[PDB]
Design an enzyme around this catalytic site. Structure first.
Site, PDB file in Angstrom:
ATOM      1  N   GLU A  15       0.707  -1.022  -0.007  1.00 45.55           N
ATOM      2  CA  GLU A  15       0.041  -0.088  -0.177  1.00 45.55           C
ATOM      3  C   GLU A  15       0.905   1.452  -0.011  1.00 45.55           C
ATOM      4  O   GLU A  15       1.876   1.346   0.989  1.00 45.55           O
ATOM      5  CB  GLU A  15      -1.008  -0.069   1.299  1.00 45.55           C
ATOM      6  CG  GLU A  15      -1.683   1.197   1.212  1.00 45.55           C
ATOM      7  CD  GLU A  15      -2.649   1.479   2.468  1.00 45.55           C
ATOM      8  OE1 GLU A  15      -3.356   0.545   3.031  1.00 45.55           O
ATOM      9  OE2 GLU A  15      -2.701   2.687   2.878  1.00 45.55           O
ATOM     10  N   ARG A  71       0.904  10.204   0.555  1.00 48.11           N
ATOM     11  CA  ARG A  71       1.600  10.928   1.701  1.00 48.11           C
ATOM     12  C   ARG A  71       3.196  11.322   1.075  1.00 48.11           C
ATOM     13  O   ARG A  71       3.555  12.491   1.665  1.00 48.11           O
ATOM     14  CB  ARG A  71       2.036  10.600   3.172  1.00 48.11           C
ATOM     15  CG  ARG A  71       0.419  10.512   3.792  1.00 48.11           C
ATOM     16  CD  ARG A  71       0.765  10.582   5.532  1.00 48.11           C
ATOM     17  NE  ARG A  71       1.358  11.711   5.636  1.00 48.11           N
ATOM     18  CZ  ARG A  71       2.028  11.826   7.095  1.00 48.11           C
ATOM     19  NH1 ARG A  71       2.083  10.994   7.689  1.00 48.11           N
ATOM     20  NH2 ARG A  71       2.507  12.962   7.296  1.00 48.11           N
ATOM     21  N   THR A 120      -4.134   6.819   1.242  1.00 50.13           N
ATOM     22  CA  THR A 120      -4.203   8.118   1.448  1.00 50.13           C
ATOM     23  C   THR A 120      -4.798   8.858   0.344  1.00 50.13           C
ATOM     24  O   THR A 120      -4.206  10.257  -0.084  1.00 50.13           O
ATOM     25  CB  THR A 120      -3.081   8.687   2.017  1.00 50.13           C
ATOM     26  OG1 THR A 120      -2.571   7.850   3.044  1.00 50.13           O
ATOM     27  CG2 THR A 120      -3.498   9.807   3.153  1.00 50.13           C
ATOM     28  N   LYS A 129     -11.871  -0.129   5.376  1.00 41.59           N
ATOM     29  CA  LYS A 129     -10.731   0.300   6.287  1.00 41.59           C
ATOM     30  C   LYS A 129     -11.400   0.592   7.649  1.00 41.59           C
ATOM     31  O   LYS A 129     -12.351   1.421   7.620  1.00 41.59           O
ATOM     32  CB  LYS A 129      -9.820   0.926   5.707  1.00 41.59           C
ATOM     33  CG  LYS A 129      -8.892   0.435   4.618  1.00 41.59           C
ATOM     34  CD  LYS A 129      -7.705  -0.200   5.081  1.00 41.59           C
ATOM     35  CE  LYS A 129      -7.010  -1.059   3.954  1.00 41.59           C
ATOM     36  NZ  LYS A 129      -7.862  -1.915   3.242  1.00 41.59           N
TER      37      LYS A 129
END
Lengths: 212, 212, 212
Positions: free
Chosen positions: B44, B48, B72, B132
């Site tokens: 993943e 960021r 993100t 999630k």
């Protein structure tokens, strides 16, 4: 056909609501006789069990005055069937605006679940001041409730989740808290074994601790 | 291209997903080699890091069968870029209905994040049952997850936030939990020093702990 | 009139904001006096008290440079009255999209409250990056804030809820934290008994612990 506020006041006298999951709908008759005999003529029947709708219908016919809630209502079909089966109001774990609007358009009282400020503000925006607080203990318990009661001073709250004999008095000490829900006194294994004496014992025990 | 449900089933075999932030995109090659060698062909890559899109592209070219998630993802531009870069699905910290709809309109699998009943209701209203749970430990951890699984008994959950060697087994013991995300075995400082041997050991350690 | 960003930098210098609930509007002058002599020319006046509007209007006239916030604003009528009374900005406990959009449409700065990723993402989608975090302690405190700052690293936060002398330094050590809200140093009893000295002692006590 009680209005939402009459239901809220009836709950205020009761203070504790049994949350019932059934595998066999016919168990609702001896169960409700045991609850009424021991002073609790109210029951939230969960749609988490497939037998929910038939149980509501049999109970309405046998005890026309019983206060009955359909709980864990997540779909429009469940709303519709909850109303035709005879429930007095609907309870939900979260707040889905299409489900709240549907009960309002069908003049069917609903107490939706909230656990943070955004959710409360959606409820207040839809004309709702009486809500379920779930899951009570994992969301912060009595501490979170007191904190939300600063800005939302006139909310009427009905907590469910992680409530037992050890903490029910702490929740009921708060004036805005109307009534708490729990299932330890109507546990599924006791219903399945048809142990009506053990159930009636636990009922009397919670009733005693609250009036302490 | 895998559908959402096939991706959930692969993650269920993996059980642990590395969440990777990197400064130099070229490091994704030795890092994925180290993960693949030790039994974990999944990553993943978080947006960021500004190196995110180049790293996903490079990895898809060098290892065409690797399972890659873009994490993100907060904007439409990132959705579009993650898709053309070659990621298999999108991961988000919360749930923005506009981002979820775009992924569904582009046939692009997405596992959005929730932490309370309101957010779960919106996910279910949009046809999503695999989410999630974030931030997992700060939102109440295993106890909040078990409380949520009472009413929403069909959700498939992937926890991220505060997960480590000391609690990964407590999360994986709950059946509805598919896999967890974690970064301690792929720590940024090790990647900055190209310490691939220490990364290989940490991966083997978590894999063994989980098998136990 | 200050812009939203200019207000944020103004709060970044004060670091601590008095949250006031008045029963008698006239008390704002002696209170603003005590606070202004001891270093804090700023207040958040709650609409939880009926005399909030008159207090702001009186205070604006007497000290035109004071920084004033209308807090606990839940309805459009309150937004319109808070602006005509002279407040510099609006603070809300949760996020009601209709209230935020009305403040933006009147060019009136607002810092809305959030406590979970879904509410943060609605804020961001509305072009807001400076938010109130409430209720801070009951939502997981410092640990929740740091976990949320991972994916939302540009958020500018103002915590309120359970903030005391024992923990104000733990929140201010986080760079994204602009300033905290509290009422222990301007407490009810002290106001009504006009204890301007006990209040002035507590204000110096918190400003000193912060700058230590």
């Amino acid at each position: 056909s009680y209005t939402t506020q009459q239901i809220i006041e009836k709950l205020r006298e009761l203070k504790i609501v049994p949350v019932i999951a059934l595998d066999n709908a016919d168990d609702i008759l001896p169960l409700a006789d045991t609850l009424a005999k021991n002073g609790l003529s109210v029951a939230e029947i969960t749609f988490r069990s497939e037998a929910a709708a038939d149980a509501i219908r049999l109970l309405r016919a046998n005890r026309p005055d019983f206060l009955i809630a359909a709980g864990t209502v997540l779909t429009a079909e469940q709303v519709v069937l909850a109303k035709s089966s005879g429930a007095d109001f609907v309870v939900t774990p979260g707040l889905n605006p299409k489900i709240v609007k549907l009960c309002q358009d069908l003049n069917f009282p609903i107490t939706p679940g909230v656990n943070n400020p955004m959710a409360i503000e959606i409820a207040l925006e839809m004309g709702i001041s009486a809500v379920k607080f779930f899951p009570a203990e994992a969301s912060g318990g009595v501490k979170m409730i007191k904190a939300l009661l600063g800005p939302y001073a006139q909310l009427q709250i009905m907590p469910t989740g992680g409530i037992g004999l050890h903490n029910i008095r702490d929740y009921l000490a708060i004036p805005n808290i109307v009534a708490c829900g729990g299932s330890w006194f109507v546990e599924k294994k006791l219903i399945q074994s048809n142990n009506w004496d053990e159930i009636g014992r636990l009922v009397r025990e919670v009733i005693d601790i609250i009036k302490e």
